[PDB]
Amino acid sequence: QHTAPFGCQIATNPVRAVNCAVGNMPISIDIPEAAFTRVVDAPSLTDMSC
Amino acid sequence: YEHVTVIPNTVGVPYKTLVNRPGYSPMVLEMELLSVTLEPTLSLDYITCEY
């Protein structure tokens, strides 16, 4: 809990390594077609200043 | 529509991804890691105590 690298937090019952900042993680999300709206059916924007 | 993305193994940091399905208006998803748990498979050899 105090000596492990990558800022590891050690928990018990069951024993486990929690929040170890090592590497990356790929996430795949299959969003349904019902959540999508067409470009033509979506509001278009003109005359923009920032 | 399948959206594949890679985020760093860092808990507490919010990451935003742009979902662009051709012909459809873009979508923005906010992802945040709350916990990353690594549980090892254990086998008890023995236990020690006071004699």
Place this chain on the structure above:
Amino acid sequence: EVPACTHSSDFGGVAIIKYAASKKGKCAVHSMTNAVTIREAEIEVEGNSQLQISFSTALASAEFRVQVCSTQVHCAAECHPPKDHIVNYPA
């Protein structure tokens, strides 16, 4: 403007066309490109408004002209491949 397009056997493309009409009436919709096909045969127009149309194409890069009533409009679309290689209906 093409917010969504997927080149497949069915109408996997969505297109929004902005216009300025003289009066209320019915106008015919037809693709002037032999590679793209529109699902809508006729729609209703009024004045300063828009219209949503469904289209089917095979090309990845699709530049097609849509003839609404008697005037033509150029559509720019970058369609993506579908999840299935074999389909259950002809096109």
